[PDB]
Assembly symmetry: C3
Homo-oligomer: 335 residues x 3
């Protein structure tokens, strides 16, 4: 019984970070309490000033990653401030019943609700808003994130041997559908409601105008590049609530990958590129062996480079000439 268990309260952190947590734990099941606040806002999504009338959990795309252990109970308070225009809710793919909790969390501006569910299956799971009659619009405008349910004894390889990560990052990939006017320029809308009709028309073409990691072209680059060191194992959580993607780490691999994102299944090893089904979250481990700047991208390279689905990982440490060596630098072809 959940009402017998101790409660803990978790403070969420903004992507691409994930809140502190244990992997393998000696602790027993708890009710883990979270709160998130919905924020509708206009966001700038590229280098040319294009805007999105966005909708977010906690002010970010994706929403923050919530981490519990299998057998824990997730207790979320969902707050929809009066400053918002739309009703919202939440559907946890990690949850059982009531359309993932959406039926029990319908909150108008000025309202909040509290949902509890048993996190009885291990894995990374999408959560998203799903208000009746406007589900795809709320999802594509930014309302999704990941629930990670770790097995109580941590991650395991196909032989049941232990696996771990030293650092975790969370990447949400967002296919955006920004309308254009007769002049061919992207439209800028005074309000969220006004963007609706034009946006549905673009959606129906199934062609995104932009595909971005974490809310903007280049969000995970420059000062905002992800970071690691040679010898460190990184977990890369990748969520795509609406559309397929194919993550790839340039100069790296997926050492151990759950592409369908469910930890009770054995992971695959040595992947060059993996596949995240639209409407799911997956997870890859990589241990860095070479220093330098990596790209982490959707390996539809048009989607990555033209449309925005690419980030960077800056890695410190010592170059290994055994793994790779420039034998002859670029030089004139011998006569």
């Amino acid at each position: 019984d959940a009402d017998k268990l101790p409660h803990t309260k978790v403070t969420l952190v903004a992507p691409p970070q994930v809140h502190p947590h244990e992997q393998a734990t000696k602790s027993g099941p708890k009710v883990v309490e979270f709160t998130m606040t919905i924020e509708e806002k206009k966001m700038v999504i590229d280098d040319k000033g294009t805007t999105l009338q966005a909708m977010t959990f906690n002010g970010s795309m994706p929403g923050p990653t919530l981490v519990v252990h299998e057998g824990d109970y997730v207790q979320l308070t969902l707050v929809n401030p009066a400053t918002n225009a739309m009703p919202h809710n939440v559907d946890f793919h990690g949850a059982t019943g009531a359309l993932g909790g959406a039926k029990l969390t319908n909150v108008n501006p000025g309202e909040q609700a509290t949902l509890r569910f048993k996190a009885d299956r291990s894995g990374t799971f999408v959560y998203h808003c799903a208000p009746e009659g406007m589900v795809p619009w709320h999802v594509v405008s930014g309302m999704s994130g990941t629930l990670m349910v770790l097995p109580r004894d941590g991650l395991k390889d196909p032989q049941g041997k232990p696996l771990h990560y030293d650092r975790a990052y969370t990447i949400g990939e967002f296919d955006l559908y920004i309308p254009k006017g007769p002049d061919g320029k992207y439209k800028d809308y005074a309000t969220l409601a006004e963007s609706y009709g034009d946006t549905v028309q673009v959606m129906r073409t199934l062609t995104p105008s932009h595909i971005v990691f974490n809310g903007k072209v280049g969000a995970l680059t420059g000062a905002n590049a992800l970071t690691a060191k040679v010898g460190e194992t990184v977990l890369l959580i990748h969520s795509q609530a609406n559309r397929d993607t194919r993550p790839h780490l340039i100069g790296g691999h997926g050492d151990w990958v759950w592409e369908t994102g469910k930890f009770a299944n054995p992971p695959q090893r040595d992947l060059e590129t993996w596949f995240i089904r639209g409407g799911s979250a997956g997870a890859a481990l990589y241990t860095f062996k070479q220093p330098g700047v990596y790209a982490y991208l959707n390996h539809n390279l048009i989607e990555a480079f033209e449309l925005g689905a690419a980030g960077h990982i800056k890695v410190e440490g010592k170059w290994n000439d055994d793994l790779m060596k420039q034998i002859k630098a670029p030089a004139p072809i011998p006569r």
Copy 2:
């Protein structure tokens, strides 16, 4: 030898039902006899009266699911009535040789043929029409269904333990390519032949006008919703003969899933969303734990909600507060 074995005759049933069959069986191999009759017809495919010049096995999209056991022989009589305009045939992905049987089943209007093949591999397999020079048109117009070949000892989990379903449903998902006129309204064609040229032009854009379960937007909703009860394990067969899809059960999971649809492989567990490759059939088991109305959909939510790829499952039984509980109903945010 097939000519030594007893024969049985099976009466097919219309989707979403599947004809009565055993899973694990004590019976030995048989020649299992089926008949299907091709029907070309104009069908209404949405709520606004849009029509498709369709082509079907047995009058339905998808055609009926045929069920045999591994080692059985499938013996199909394929009938193309004189009331039809086009030649047709059948390609069983479950079969070996002669382009899946297409080369041996070329039937003009007024003709029939009988094909036998050994069902020597377990799984759900697409069958479809494939007449030379018009293969994609016949497939996208409705001519596909599933052959399920059950292992003789029934379904098994990754550890070789037994799995079963108490109820089976079959869902065919159809990417449709309906042309539009200068006025932007969908075209209605007097005949099947007349729809061809315009339809090929739409196909070549790779953008479906509609994506529907079982022949129509909302085919598996209302009076036609699928049904189950808490405690019942349902098999959901999903076929897509031309285009990728990503099935998801809202408020549920894929407890055991063969997404590539081949039962000799271990299934994955706890899936939120799985992946059916265009040109294949997959299979998922789910045991219901909560009552209420579920949605079963393609989790490209635009494809589901805007284009038609979504159905409903109405489930009876008792709510389980341990799995999910509304702690605080939606209420004013405390001052």
Copy 3:
């Protein structure tokens, strides 16, 4: 240490063939030396004279398949002749560091470079050109191929039993983005540089004009069909550096398939259709049991039949009536 090991030199062969190699080997690790020369050229890609301003490794699409064993070192000399207009490089997905080697192989026309890397992971891996700021253009114009890294003890089934192929073919699938003029005819460009702007515009629509195996509609058909015999096991390597595809052998199966292309993972059996993620190479084994002409295709049938993603395999041997038999040839429906 690589500088302690013996060296061997390999002569590459044009697709769809793959250079002679051992599978399971008694040999120890070597530095395996390869050379490839970049050729930019205008190529005719369909039956109606449409041209592509193409870019190739060794004059072919795909580039040749390089085969080594796990633990070997790949040492590639990459030559960019002065007759070319563009800078190029190479990114091996099979390699670790320096963006797959791209950072160490930047060659202007008239230059060459030599890269060494440790092939420490088994599988089929994409290699492609990736010059900074023009990565997708170089890839979609033809600059990709496969590195196959065989395990030292050859291929294994899920139970660790030996698997092998008697013949290997390599298929690269290329989503092409050829621009059209106001008249709706495909544009023909005097130079590679001139094609750039228009091509980027087409790319951004995410809709290929053509999708071809090995450089042209019908490249693997007629005199150029692949060949086998009943009783022979064929390895089919399928690379797609930019876009998802779903290979299928009509009248056949994937007997053993690594769809994500990494041999340390167990293969799946009995596949009807498998999935190659954009930015990866996969591998399927099939042992022929029936003679005749097979099609090997992308089972988005529009992509196959309308856009060009289909080839043929002509197979010799004896028909097996146990696997498939025409019981009744097409005949008038009995009155």
